[PDB]
Write a protein that binds this ligand. Structure first.
Ligand SMILES: COc1ccc2c(nc(NC(=O)c3cccnc3)[n+]3cc[nH]c23)c1OC
Ligand SMILES: COc1ccc2c(nc(NC(=O)c3cccnc3)[n+]3cc[nH]c23)c1OC
Lengths: 546, 544
């Protein structure tokens, strides 16, 4: 029938972590031979066969070789811990190889995590080959071809390697992977050797930077005294193995593409933030262009990088759809945990804006005034602000960010708001009862209250964003499937529910009409609870029945 | 082409529109051709009379040829907007085709519509007694006996500003003529006429007696005992109340009445006090109970009941039996009427009597396996009745709801009793947009309940259906502009405009549903004490 396939389009193309396929498995088994439709299909057939019969393997493997080729994102799942079979894993690696480098970088964090799942004997056989395509040989081969990839690959492995349970099994494995990668570069040729020297430079440079930060932390003083001490140390030359006011050009670790040269001491500040991170500036190799970054000594950033990848990727997904909310997905890396960098975007924390200029409208109006509309605020600015908001409420909801407040959100003079400091993930909040959506009175007034052409514009935008994201779920879920054993604090409290929790937020059961209605619901409770008048109005309604 | 869809939007959607005034006369080129469908016609007419001498002759040829009319268009054409005598003739030829039952519903508005010109038609007929509109109403009035009844009483309230004086004059001509055509008739007319006389004589007699129960001061009990002896004592009024000749009940013509029963009459708790009397039906010593109220003009309430009745019919033709109860109401004159009475307890009553609503349903219809010890279908009739009434209340902007206002039957239907406040008007400062007792929602089993989800689902679909049949209601209300209902009178112009916002026709259906959900959410949390406490904690969050 058509009803026969109608049952199948639902299964071929709905969730990638459902067990649900039970009797259904056999239905696919037979139509499978006739219609190996698309890449989407292959992921589903694989799930049922391998483990139970020794012979099934032979028939399915032949199907896979002929099958319409899997998409890189669907391929990720195969590297998951659920699929053991050595033959299918090789296939996934072949899919990755076909993908362009830009795509490889997004996932790289996941792939590094993926190493655990891939079998130990593959890692040791290679070690034997060097010292006295399987995935891991592959990651190294590619890391070497392209300099930026080498940089990221190195920094991810390095966080893993530094110093119990399963931790010994994985630390030992990663330690080994890194040693092999460094030995391949030391040996390679000009280009490979060249990569090796630049890493050496990055590594040496940070240690000196870290040494310096540690001296600043010791000397006692309020922030201002501490920052003055910081300015002086950088400008002290030959106190340090690297001399800051000038050095030899180093590929910035945060961005390999840009070299640095010097740092400018006067331009460096420290943040109000309770862990006291520097801003730094550098000049860089071309026409003394500034760059700044932050550099943070007190926390581990691994969790923050994961979320930023999550935001970075989501923005890409919507931009492909031609939905562009002006989100800022700033670069994080951590170095070895407890330090890291972050890209700095010029912005102002919301609370700063409110203390310094009465309300948000005044602030845009100051930077971008246009008498006519909408608020004497240049039209675009308003629009970009509306869009940035929609983008974040939906993105925050899916990732269950919590512990948001005025210190945590910022504005820009263009308009965008963005978030920062995702210390609390997947519904952990220090307060007993978060609102489902995280908006502020200050922010809603920015839109003009409930009927604004503008507020209506915002809700509409969230709905379309939510719907678009629901569609691209498979990619996000597999990426989380791969962070099970991640060593992100928020994930570790219950790793099993890590992926289960994002699925619930995604609300994949419901129809589109239903999904919007459900989301619509969350915004409303949150906005009513935020607005002073809306609560007065509800008290009045309670009063009506007396 | 692509104009094919944009065409169908002006056919199926817009109900009364300025929209595209330059575009009014541009649909014209492709208009001669797609005259093929019925609804098109109503829109066709809105544009052509706007210019002087010439379109006129060509458009009727278009009109006479046009795919024929649904009755609803016709309501639009009787209205004060379309002035042309042919189109009004046309509208009447449409009415002619409608079955009597339909004329019954629209009948109330039709009496009103006659209020629009031409006066010349009525004075010509006056010169003619001593199918234009009035002539039509009369002639059909005589055709049907139940119909004739309603017509008469509707006119009689109206004859009982400086332009309330001019139409009143017109109304008297129309009533008197009707009565004159009745005397002159063949047997059956005179039979109806005679009946109308009997009815009046009787009403005036009950009125004087009723006047004599209020004239006496004292306790509520003293006035009811007085009421029993007044009806008991034969022949002090020329109509004898413990027995008289078979009369067709004025409120409901089909039932015949012999007498009242005095021991059965009781008097209600309200400050201005309504009586509940039993009557006997001419047939089978069956009884019919009703209420007779002495205080106010009931024209407002009857309008709402027409509306309820109308809405139920549409939904039932949709096979949503929402289990509405639309009891019959008639105003005899301003300050007296009859209301069908339906056995029921008022919610507040049900609550003193039983802790909560389930106990009540549980006592009358218990089943051990039925959801909350009740027959599954009793709970269902309840959910559905609730749903209907939240939607209907909403479109109609009924305010003043409280627990003496909402009655409940032993069977489960919920219904609203009293309609002093319409189209938003409410004594209280802020109405909730939807009216739900805490007690009503606990009766569902809380926001948690499955039944509660069925409740909500029912409201959206009810709402969606009624939206589809907007045209019918909007025309009916357009004819109620100069109505004499207190709440249209305050803002006559804006009155019709208010129902039209409730329908929210601007919105596509996903949007419409959404909007409605919103109203329900507000109103429900407001009532629940735990949902409020939760809004409280969220408020607490940003604060710090
Ligand atoms: C004026 O204050 C800030 C301006 C820009 C900032 C900004 N902070 C940023 N990052 C953070 O301070 C941060 C802390 C902890 C974990 N993740 C991020 N950050 C990342 C990209 N742009 C910015 C400012 O401090 C409130
Ligand atoms: C328990 O008290 C009542 C039970 C049934 C009643 C009922 N009252 C009804 N009508 C009225 O009381 C009424 C007053 C003013 C305007 N419209 C209706 N009414 C309309 C149809 N069924 C019923 C009861 O009194 C509170």
């Amino acid at each position: 029938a058509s009803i026969r396939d109608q049952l199948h389009t639902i299964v071929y193309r709905y969730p990638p972590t459902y067990v649900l396929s039970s009797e259904e498995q056999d239905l696919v088994w037979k139509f499978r031979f006739y219609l190996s439709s698309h890449k989407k299909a292959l992921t589903k057939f694989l799930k049922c066969i391998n483990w139970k019969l020794e012979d099934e393997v032979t028939q399915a493997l032949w199907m896979l070789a002929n099958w319409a080729p899997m998409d890189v994102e669907d391929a990720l799942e195969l590297l998951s811990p659920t699929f053991t079979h050595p033959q299918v894993r090789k296939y996934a690696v072949s899919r990755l190889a076909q993908a362009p480098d830009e795509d490889l970088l997004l996932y790289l964090l996941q792939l590094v995590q993926a190493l655990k799942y891939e079998d130990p004997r593959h890692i040791v056989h290679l070690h034997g080959c060097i010292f006295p395509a399987n995935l891991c040989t592959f990651l190294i081969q590619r890391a070497c071809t392209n300099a930026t990839l080498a940089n990221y690959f190195y920094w991810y492995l390095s966080i893993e390697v530094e110093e119990r349970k399963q931790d010994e099994r994985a630390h030992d494995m990663y330690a080994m992977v890194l040693k092999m990668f460094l030995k391949v570069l030391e040996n390679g040729n000009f280009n490979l050797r060249g990569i090796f020297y630049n890493l050496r430079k990055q590594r040496r440079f940070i240690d000196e930077l870290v040494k310096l930060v540690k001296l600043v932390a010791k000397e006692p003083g309020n922030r201002n005294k501490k920052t003055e001490k910081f300015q002086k140390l950088l400008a002290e030359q030959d106190m340090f193995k690297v001399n800051f006011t000038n050095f030899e050009p180093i590929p910035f670790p945060l961005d390999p593409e840009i070299y640095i040269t010097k740092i400018v001491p006067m331009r460096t500040s420290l943040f109000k933030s309770a862990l006291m991170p520097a801003k730094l500036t550098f000049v860089t190799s071309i026409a003394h262009h500034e760059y700044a970054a932050i550099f943070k000594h007190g926390d581990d950033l691994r969790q923050d990088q994961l979320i930023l990848q999550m935001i970075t990727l989501m923005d890409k997904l919507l931009r492909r759809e031609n939905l562009d909310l002006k989100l800022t997905p700033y670069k994080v890396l951590a170095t070895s945990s407890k330090h890291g960098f972050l890209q700095y975007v010029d912005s102002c924390t919301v609370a700063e804006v409110l203390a310094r200029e009465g309300n948000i409208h005044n602030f845009f109006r100051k930077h971008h005034p246009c008498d006519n509309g909408p608020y004497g605020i240049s039209a675009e600015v308003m629009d970009t602000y509306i869009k940035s908001c929609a983008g974040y409420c939906v993105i925050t909801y899916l990732l269950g960010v919590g512990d948001r407040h005025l210190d945590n959100l910022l504005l820009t003079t263009n308009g965008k708001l963005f978030h920062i400091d995702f210390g609390y993930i997947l519904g952990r909040d220090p307060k007993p009862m978060p609102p489902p959506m995280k908006l502020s009175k200050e922010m809603v007034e920015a839109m003009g209250g409930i009927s604004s052409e503008h507020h209506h514009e915002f809700r509409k935008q969230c709905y379309t964003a939510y719907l678009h994201l629901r569609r691209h779920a498979n990619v996000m879920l597999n990426l989380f499937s791969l962070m099970v054993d991640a060593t992100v604090p928020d994930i570790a409290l219950e790793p099993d529910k890590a992926v289960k929790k994002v699925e619930e937020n995604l609300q994949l059961g419901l129809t589109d009409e239903e999904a919007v209605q459900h989301l619509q619901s969350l915004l409303d409770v949150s906005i009513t609870a935020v607005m002073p008048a809306l609560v007065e109005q509800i008290h009045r309604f309670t009063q009506y029945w007396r």
